Amino acid sequence: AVKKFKPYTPSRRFMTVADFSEITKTEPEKSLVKPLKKTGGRNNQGRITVRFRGGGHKRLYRIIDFKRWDKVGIPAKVAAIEYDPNRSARIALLHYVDGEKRYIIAPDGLQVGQQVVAGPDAPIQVGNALPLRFIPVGTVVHAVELEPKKGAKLARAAGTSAQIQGREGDYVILRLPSGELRKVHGECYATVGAVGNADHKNIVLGKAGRSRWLGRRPHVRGAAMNPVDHPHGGGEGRAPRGRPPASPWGWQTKGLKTRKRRKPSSRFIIA
Amino acid sequence: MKRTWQPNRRKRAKTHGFRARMRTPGGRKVLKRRRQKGRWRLTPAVRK
RNA sequence: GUGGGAGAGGGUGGUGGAAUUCCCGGAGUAGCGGUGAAAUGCGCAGAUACCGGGAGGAACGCCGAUGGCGAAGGCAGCCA
RNA sequence: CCGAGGGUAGGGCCCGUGACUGGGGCGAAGUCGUAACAAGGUAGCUGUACCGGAAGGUGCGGCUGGA
RNA sequence: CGCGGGGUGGAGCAGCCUGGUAGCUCGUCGGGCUCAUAACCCGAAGGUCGUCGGUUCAAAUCCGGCCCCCGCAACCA
RNA sequence: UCGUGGAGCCAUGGGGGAAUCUGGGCGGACCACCGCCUAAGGCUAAGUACUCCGGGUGACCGAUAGCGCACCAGUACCGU
RNA sequence: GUGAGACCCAGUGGAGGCCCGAACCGGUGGGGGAUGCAAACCCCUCGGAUGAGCUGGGGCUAGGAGUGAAAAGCUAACCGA
RNA sequence: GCGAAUGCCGGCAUGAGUAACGAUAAAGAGGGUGAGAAUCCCUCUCGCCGUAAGCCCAAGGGUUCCUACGCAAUGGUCGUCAGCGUAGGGUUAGGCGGGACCUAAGGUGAAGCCGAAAGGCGUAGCCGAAGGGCAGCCGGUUAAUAUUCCGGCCCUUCCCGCAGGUGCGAUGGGGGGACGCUCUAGGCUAGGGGGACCGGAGCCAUGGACGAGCCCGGCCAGAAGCGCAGGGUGGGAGGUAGGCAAAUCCGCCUCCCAACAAGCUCUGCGUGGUGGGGAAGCCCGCAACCCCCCGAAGCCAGGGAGCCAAGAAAAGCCUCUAAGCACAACCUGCGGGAACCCGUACCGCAAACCGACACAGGUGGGCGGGUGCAAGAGCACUCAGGCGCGCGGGAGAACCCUCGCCAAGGAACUCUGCAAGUUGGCCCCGUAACUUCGGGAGAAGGGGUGCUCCCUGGGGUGAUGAGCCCCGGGGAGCCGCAGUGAACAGGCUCUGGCGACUGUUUACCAAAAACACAGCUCUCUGCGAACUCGUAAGAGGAGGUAUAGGGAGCGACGCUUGCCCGGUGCCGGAAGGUCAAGGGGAGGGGUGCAAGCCCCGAACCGAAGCCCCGGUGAACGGCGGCCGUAACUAUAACGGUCCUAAGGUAGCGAAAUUCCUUGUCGGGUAAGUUCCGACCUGCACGAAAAGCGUAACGACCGGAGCGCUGUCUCGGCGAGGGACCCGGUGAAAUUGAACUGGCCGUGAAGAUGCGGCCUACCCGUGGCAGGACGAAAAGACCCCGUGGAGCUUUACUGCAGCCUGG
RNA sequence: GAUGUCGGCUCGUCGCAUCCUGGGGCUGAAGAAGGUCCCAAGGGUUGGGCUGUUCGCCCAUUAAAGCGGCACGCGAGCUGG
Ligand SMILES: NC[C@@H]1O[C@H](O[C@H]2[C@@H](O)[C@H](O[C@@H]3[C@@H](O)[C@H](N)C[C@H](N)[C@H]3O[C@H]3O[C@H](CO)[C@@H](O)[C@H](O)[C@H]3N)O[C@@H]2CO)[C@H](N)[C@@H](O)[C@@H]1O
Ligand SMILES: [Mg+2]
Ligand SMILES: [Mg+2]
Ligand SMILES: [Mg+2]
Ligand SMILES: [Mg+2]
Ligand SMILES: [Mg+2]
Ligand SMILES: [Mg+2]
Ligand SMILES: [Mg+2]
Ligand SMILES: [Mg+2]
Ligand SMILES: [Mg+2]
Ligand SMILES: [Mg+2]
Ligand SMILES: [Mg+2]
Ligand SMILES: [Mg+2]
Ligand SMILES: [Mg+2]
Ligand SMILES: [Mg+2]
Ligand SMILES: [Mg+2]
Ligand SMILES: [Mg+2]
Ligand SMILES: [Mg+2]
Ligand SMILES: [Mg+2]
Ligand SMILES: [Mg+2]
Ligand SMILES: [Mg+2]
Ligand SMILES: [Mg+2]
Ligand SMILES: [Mg+2]
Ligand SMILES: [Mg+2]
Ligand SMILES: [Mg+2]
Ligand SMILES: [Mg+2]
Ligand SMILES: [Mg+2]
Ligand SMILES: [Mg+2]
Ligand SMILES: [Mg+2]
Ligand SMILES: [Mg+2]
Ligand SMILES: [Mg+2]
Ligand SMILES: [Mg+2]
Ligand SMILES: [Mg+2]
Ligand SMILES: [Mg+2]
Ligand SMILES: [Mg+2]
Ligand SMILES: [Mg+2]
Ligand SMILES: [Mg+2]
Ligand SMILES: [Mg+2]
Ligand SMILES: [Mg+2]
Ligand SMILES: [Mg+2]
Ligand SMILES: [Mg+2]
Ligand SMILES: [Mg+2]
Ligand SMILES: [Mg+2]
Ligand SMILES: [Mg+2]
Ligand SMILES: [Mg+2]
Ligand SMILES: [Mg+2]
Ligand SMILES: [Mg+2]
Ligand SMILES: [Mg+2]
Ligand SMILES: [Mg+2]
Ligand SMILES: [Mg+2]
Ligand SMILES: [Mg+2]
Ligand SMILES: [Mg+2]
Ligand SMILES: [Mg+2]
Ligand SMILES: [Mg+2]
Ligand SMILES: [Mg+2]
Ligand SMILES: [Mg+2]
Ligand SMILES: [Mg+2]
Ligand SMILES: [Mg+2]
Ligand SMILES: [Mg+2]
Ligand SMILES: [Mg+2]
Ligand SMILES: [Mg+2]
Ligand SMILES: [Mg+2]
Ligand SMILES: [Mg+2]
Ligand SMILES: [Mg+2]
Ligand SMILES: [Mg+2]
Ligand SMILES: [Mg+2]
Ligand SMILES: [Mg+2]
Ligand SMILES: [Mg+2]
Ligand SMILES: [Mg+2]
Ligand SMILES: [Mg+2]
Ligand SMILES: [Mg+2]
Ligand SMILES: [Mg+2]
Ligand SMILES: [Mg+2]
Ligand SMILES: [Mg+2]
Ligand SMILES: [Mg+2]
Ligand SMILES: [Mg+2]
Ligand SMILES: [Mg+2]
Ligand SMILES: [Mg+2]
Ligand SMILES: [Mg+2]
Ligand SMILES: [Mg+2]
Ligand SMILES: [Mg+2]
Ligand SMILES: [Mg+2]
Ligand SMILES: [Mg+2]
Ligand SMILES: [Mg+2]
Ligand SMILES: [Mg+2]
Ligand SMILES: [Mg+2]
Ligand SMILES: [Mg+2]
Ligand SMILES: [Mg+2]
Ligand SMILES: [Mg+2]
Ligand SMILES: [Mg+2]
Ligand SMILES: [Mg+2]
Ligand SMILES: [Mg+2]
Ligand SMILES: [Mg+2]
Ligand SMILES: [Mg+2]
Ligand SMILES: [Mg+2]
Ligand SMILES: [Mg+2]
Ligand SMILES: [Mg+2]
Ligand SMILES: [Mg+2]
Ligand SMILES: [Mg+2]
Ligand SMILES: [Mg+2]
Ligand SMILES: [Mg+2]
Ligand SMILES: [Mg+2]
Ligand SMILES: [Mg+2]
Ligand SMILES: [Mg+2]
Ligand SMILES: [Mg+2]
Ligand SMILES: [Mg+2]
Ligand SMILES: [Mg+2]
Ligand SMILES: [Mg+2]
Ligand SMILES: [Mg+2]
Ligand SMILES: [Mg+2]
Ligand SMILES: [Mg+2]
Ligand SMILES: [Mg+2]
Ligand SMILES: [Mg+2]
Ligand SMILES: [Mg+2]
Ligand SMILES: [Mg+2]
Ligand SMILES: [Mg+2]
Ligand SMILES: [Mg+2]
Ligand SMILES: [Mg+2]
Ligand SMILES: [Mg+2]
Ligand SMILES: [Mg+2]
Ligand SMILES: [Mg+2]
Ligand SMILES: [Mg+2]
Ligand SMILES: [Mg+2]
Ligand SMILES: [Mg+2]
Ligand SMILES: [Mg+2]
Ligand SMILES: [Mg+2]
Ligand SMILES: [Mg+2]
Ligand SMILES: [Mg+2]
Ligand SMILES: [Mg+2]
Ligand SMILES: [Mg+2]
Ligand SMILES: [Mg+2]
Ligand SMILES: [Mg+2]
Ligand SMILES: [Mg+2]
Ligand SMILES: [Mg+2]
Ligand SMILES: [Mg+2]
Ligand SMILES: [Mg+2]
Ligand SMILES: [Mg+2]
Ligand SMILES: [Mg+2]
Ligand SMILES: [Mg+2]
Ligand SMILES: [Mg+2]
Ligand SMILES: [Mg+2]
Ligand SMILES: [Mg+2]
């Protein structure tokens, strides 16, 4: 839905925020070895190596389960659906019959009360994980793994998802969120359903700050700087680049493909 | 107005200290050069 | 009120084959396409023509009517 | 106290005039094409939409006041 | 003021650095089709090449001087 | 001395890769003679270099000189 | 209020890079100052003031390098190195 | 061998008894002291501060602290005084703050990884604090210390003995510690105000008052118990696939009871045995200690509500079992004993810290009383407490600074209303276009405002009732020029430009129309992501995963964003052209008597790149000319032709763009090179280096009005601080030497200095700036030097990086 | 090894090739006017609108609203459009 505000102040006549009803029934994290001190920091060993990051509200890190083959067959009830500052997606706190509690990136549709489980035996329904091989071609899934046992790495952003296009050998063809067609091993797990909280792509930040609360500091334009700072910089009084769109480091930034050519990763891609 | 020198005992020790000067080969050379010139104070004398 | 009838009335979910386009593989060679006649265009970097495998979208041939339903605009594959 | 009226300030309605600009009505024989009336030589029309010297042309849907 | 480009039948353009050979489209004129005007068809006429003089056997064509049309420049003070 | 030169020799990062005296390197590309020497393990005084240190001298200075300091100087003072 | 709604009222409520304005953070115009009180100061005036706020202490990044809401600005009173 | 090098070092001059003596909070006098006092000590007047100019703590400073002696120098004067000189004292802790505790960022760093060496990452561990954890309150003393010594009251650890208890026991498990922002309830407390009440030495002045008068003061701490507020918390009983299962502890299910609770716990606050303090008053000496009211930003605290940006760690502490050990061992009592190290002076918004100075500057935390004003930490006055700023005394010029006032006029000033005025708080009336419906709004324009007396409504606390406070409502009445009577305290409106907005910036000449910004588009990137730093290891990205992350441009929102892929870039093309090693060896050469050994070397097979083919504009970019033509003329819908990759669309237009140009009309003005509206031969607008608009916003830039004024006609008077004079102290740039006049000539072309002529006794003081081509800076501009740097690219040549064959 | 550059403000002084005001000769001078030349600066030679402007062009006046030199006089006198 997204909450909108009356214009009782500019920057706030455009501002809009998430429908937090989805979450509710729990704001406090499941402390139980669930959150960890999380180190902030826009740089590595001294130098900033990603520009314009910093500041931004204090943040606790919830550790979530991205490889569910741990508890194969051990079912669990969905305790709650909480808020995670560290992601676009919302998480779900789930108590296992085992007694062990874990977190999972909350799929769309999942509800407090439902039961869930991962395994080959597992029933094909929202929240359940299984190797892609045992998932019916056509079903939508999220939190897909890339190589087996390596853990989930695909379709995890709010409202994202992958769809099975069909098997072919030990591999199964997935159409990824981006739209790429990749062959992924059949043993790679993946929980059924879409990522949920798809209204996300619609929230309008609103003001200059807030972009700040999210830890994103101002991004200054190339042309605005000087010959020394960027290739675009310079020229007496406003100019047009000067041919041909480039990054501060000098590589062309409009259309120039960048992924490695001889990458073995290919052969399993097509899109 | 707020001037350049703002004395901090701990900062001074941790920066120009003896131990500090010892860790870095550059510093060890400083201690060397000074000791060899005859300085009475090899390091910024400061008491705590 | 009780008992029954017909209907492309409406809304939701699901599903079927035909055909177009594109992708992959095969086989195959000098044109294809288009018109009043042409040209642009496509094709020896292997097109058109044919087979196989696949993706996706929109529309529902025969029944179909000079027919039916709706207050009008309008409503047509099958299923609940 | 009330008070004609004067004063100050801010609104409302109406009339005149206004560089310049917009269509419009009207005027024997000026210019360009030829949309429409007969398959008007691409059936006409039509609400909408884009476009063009101009009539108009095309899209989509509808009408017969065309076959 | 200083640079460079251009004046060719009636209009708009070729020809000129590689001199002897003036080409194209439109218009103009005579004749056809049409009741007729266009369109369309056949045929034809028209060019100090801006100039003043010079080189050459020979000059639109090469070399100078003038009259022109259009552009480019004109900065530090 | 050798700056690609006719460029050997001595080193050696990469590739190929022997033989043990009928073995193997060199004598300035390369061949052939003639001749030199024995690689892929190691050690080895003296003659040689310097002057923090002790001494001796000086057509060296004599307190703006001579070491920055003849004196309580790498001090005072200056600088994070 | 209506079939049910939308919606409209009061009341409560106390949102906001909202308003005025001290502390605090600035530095708009003018005047004074110019061997200064001061190698950037003073008086009047003015901007922000729950936020992209201010600030103490502890830490990290540096010379073709850092840092930069971008002036070639800042990097110990003069930085195109 | 010195005369010059803006030479180097030192000394001493000149300016000059000049500027200045460092906030315009302010001084006077009487006593002392002494060789000498405006300046030291005492007293009495006076003025200034009083969210301080007063207290307390951190940092830094290191003896400046206290006492006795002293005055050369140091204090911008003086000095008997001092932060100065000499000497001697002075800083006391189980509880305050640190360490024999804990962890943060980060640092270090066994293992482990990397790197010519130096060295770089880095696990465990260790280090690291204004954060966590932890036991002291009220008084009293010294010249100087005190939560440190002492008094009273109250605690903390360890060790021993002892009685009484229990499965005791980890560096392991679990719980816990434990956390945001904004808004808030109920009690409290700190703090403050009154009192007809309590206790007091005293005072009746000057016209009055013996007064329910005036004046002073009416508390602090305090175990257990005791109350009053709160914070925490369901009890049971069984199973169990988890807590890298070792558990009767967690966690999970299952099930009797019970729940806007009770009890159990843990704080806060009163109360408390009792200890402590205790003024105004003369001679240096009298004690109560009660009652109302206001009341926190603090306490109960882990209280509650709402919100999105979703808010440290570890130890102590509970609990659980492991080995083990059950003679251990822990637990509770109770007496005895034991209890280390470092800091403690003083300054601390400043004369002791950072600014070379006793420098109008800078410096984090807490307290910060009273009255009045709507409120307040604001403003005015004032407590406590602290100061009068380390040169003074006169005079009463110009001129300067800061300040007050002004006839008549009222922007005529001027680049410009620059500056100054006006307005100003609160209550009430009452308010337009336009708009994104919030706003514009404090629009504008007005009225009221003091005190006196009467009537009258709600509340809080009490108790319902009186006091005490908090909000009000209505009549009359008094006095001034004036009632927010002083101080704090908007001038307003109309119409343009730019940027949407709050915000950032050139520390120290630019605060802006610049940057940023939400938002739009393009593009890269399938995760060991792209990209960035690094030789590397490794790291950031990100414990993220295309609703994500990098790069680019545009820059809210509205309506929109045309045509040209010729060139350039980028994307796509398994074909061809070309193409390096390398493979391949037709063929040829050097030598040998030779087998040989050596050299060249064509066909042909050989990547990426370039070529070629195609796409591509919110990629770099580009987006025409010349003739003719209507039945008055003008003009040209229409036509011809040349060129192109295509010839600029909507919209806007003499503009932040228009040269000609003060374009031409219209508006405003008495008059308008600016402004607004129109037009359009746009020298040279135009669509994301976006185009045209837009409510609101702006210390942004332009044009008008009203108000109001010393801006001005046009200047006048007055005040304070300087200037001037006297006493004290006493600089600076500059300076070839000077005995340094005018004119007209002359001269290297602008003469005190040459010529001629003309004035002119010697020397100062207060003023003014025409000259000394005055000072200050070896001119920035300019040119020059085969000088230097920063920047650019289809300049040359390299290197990183990346692509590529072997 | 530096002579501050436009305009304005303030203070002026000088030249005459005179814009007023004084004398005067011609006149196609009737008068009143004017025109042109001659002598003569003693003293005069306004306030606004527009522009940085000098200069101009306007508005309202006047006897007239003169020209030009003094480093396009004057920044150790001010202003900085
Ligand atoms: N006709 C009046 C209105 O305006 C237009 O009509 C105007 C024009 O179309 C029309 O112009 C015509 C022209 O069309 C036609 N081809 C040629 C003719 N000579 C012109 O005629 C015009 O001009 C002449 C003078 O020159 C006058 O005398 C005459 O009255 C006038 N109508 O003249 C009309 C003016 O009245 C609309 N087309 C018409 O439907 C409408 O009703
Ligand atoms: Mg930006
Ligand atoms: Mg810039
Ligand atoms: Mg830099
Ligand atoms: Mg570039
Ligand atoms: Mg560059
Ligand atoms: Mg430009
Ligand atoms: Mg550029
Ligand atoms: Mg200093
Ligand atoms: Mg410290
Ligand atoms: Mg040291
Ligand atoms: Mg020192
Ligand atoms: Mg269907
Ligand atoms: Mg099909
Ligand atoms: Mg197609
Ligand atoms: Mg095929
Ligand atoms: Mg084939
Ligand atoms: Mg085809
Ligand atoms: Mg019907
Ligand atoms: Mg339907
Ligand atoms: Mg009346
Ligand atoms: Mg009108
Ligand atoms: Mg009208
Ligand atoms: Mg008309
Ligand atoms: Mg008409
Ligand atoms: Mg006619
Ligand atoms: Mg038609
Ligand atoms: Mg029509
Ligand atoms: Mg027709
Ligand atoms: Mg037709
Ligand atoms: Mg047709
Ligand atoms: Mg119609
Ligand atoms: Mg058109
Ligand atoms: Mg049109
Ligand atoms: Mg046209
Ligand atoms: Mg069309
Ligand atoms: Mg139509
Ligand atoms: Mg149609
Ligand atoms: Mg139709
Ligand atoms: Mg119909
Ligand atoms: Mg029809
Ligand atoms: Mg039909
Ligand atoms: Mg011709
Ligand atoms: Mg011929
Ligand atoms: Mg011809
Ligand atoms: Mg003919
Ligand atoms: Mg004929
Ligand atoms: Mg042998
Ligand atoms: Mg050898
Ligand atoms: Mg060899
Ligand atoms: Mg040899
Ligand atoms: Mg030889
Ligand atoms: Mg040898
Ligand atoms: Mg040896
Ligand atoms: Mg030896
Ligand atoms: Mg020797
Ligand atoms: Mg001697
Ligand atoms: Mg010496
Ligand atoms: Mg001597
Ligand atoms: Mg010595
Ligand atoms: Mg109804
Ligand atoms: Mg409400
Ligand atoms: Mg605000
Ligand atoms: Mg504001
Ligand atoms: Mg404010
Ligand atoms: Mg000034
Ligand atoms: Mg302010
Ligand atoms: Mg620090
Ligand atoms: Mg810091
Ligand atoms: Mg550098
Ligand atoms: Mg600096
Ligand atoms: Mg440099
Ligand atoms: Mg340098
Ligand atoms: Mg000399
Ligand atoms: Mg000297
Ligand atoms: Mg001197
Ligand atoms: Mg003097
Ligand atoms: Mg004097
Ligand atoms: Mg003086
Ligand atoms: Mg003083
Ligand atoms: Mg005495
Ligand atoms: Mg006072
Ligand atoms: Mg200290
Ligand atoms: Mg001392
Ligand atoms: Mg003292
Ligand atoms: Mg004494
Ligand atoms: Mg003295
Ligand atoms: Mg004495
Ligand atoms: Mg002393
Ligand atoms: Mg202690
Ligand atoms: Mg750490
Ligand atoms: Mg390390
Ligand atoms: Mg290290
Ligand atoms: Mg520690
Ligand atoms: Mg601590
Ligand atoms: Mg904390
Ligand atoms: Mg804690
Ligand atoms: Mg602490
Ligand atoms: Mg303690
Ligand atoms: Mg106590
Ligand atoms: Mg003391
Ligand atoms: Mg136990
Ligand atoms: Mg634990
Ligand atoms: Mg824990
Ligand atoms: Mg806690
Ligand atoms: Mg309360
Ligand atoms: Mg109290
Ligand atoms: Mg009292
Ligand atoms: Mg009383
Ligand atoms: Mg009396
Ligand atoms: Mg009390
Ligand atoms: Mg008590
Ligand atoms: Mg107790
Ligand atoms: Mg209780
Ligand atoms: Mg229970
Ligand atoms: Mg175990
Ligand atoms: Mg259990
Ligand atoms: Mg008591
Ligand atoms: Mg009582
Ligand atoms: Mg209360
Ligand atoms: Mg055991
Ligand atoms: Mg046991
Ligand atoms: Mg010890
Ligand atoms: Mg003390
Ligand atoms: Mg303070
Ligand atoms: Mg000070
Ligand atoms: Mg100091
Ligand atoms: Mg002083
Ligand atoms: Mg402060
Ligand atoms: Mg008030
Ligand atoms: Mg105050
Ligand atoms: Mg005076
Ligand atoms: Mg006046
Ligand atoms: Mg008056
Ligand atoms: Mg004016
Ligand atoms: Mg004026
Ligand atoms: Mg102006
Ligand atoms: Mg002003
Ligand atoms: Mg209005
Ligand atoms: Mg209206
Ligand atoms: Mg307004
Ligand atoms: Mg207004």
Ligand SMILES: [Mg+2]
């Ligand atoms: Mg009164």
Ligand SMILES: [Mg+2]
């Ligand atoms: Mg007042």
Ligand SMILES: [Mg+2]
């Ligand atoms: Mg004020």
Ligand SMILES: [Mg+2]
């Ligand atoms: Mg406009």
Ligand SMILES: [Mg+2]
């Ligand atoms: Mg702005």
Ligand SMILES: [Mg+2]
């Ligand atoms: Mg702002």
Ligand SMILES: [Mg+2]
């Ligand atoms: Mg900044």
Ligand SMILES: [Mg+2]
């Ligand atoms: Mg700033």
Ligand SMILES: [Mg+2]
């Ligand atoms: Mg600045």
Ligand SMILES: [Mg+2]
């Ligand atoms: Mg500003």
Ligand SMILES: [Mg+2]
């Ligand atoms: Mg400024």
Ligand SMILES: [Mg+2]
């Ligand atoms: Mg900026």
Ligand SMILES: [Mg+2]
């Ligand atoms: Mg990470």
Ligand SMILES: [Mg+2]
């Ligand atoms: Mg991005």
Ligand SMILES: [Mg+2]
């Ligand atoms: Mg992106």
Ligand SMILES: [Mg+2]
């Ligand atoms: Mg921009």
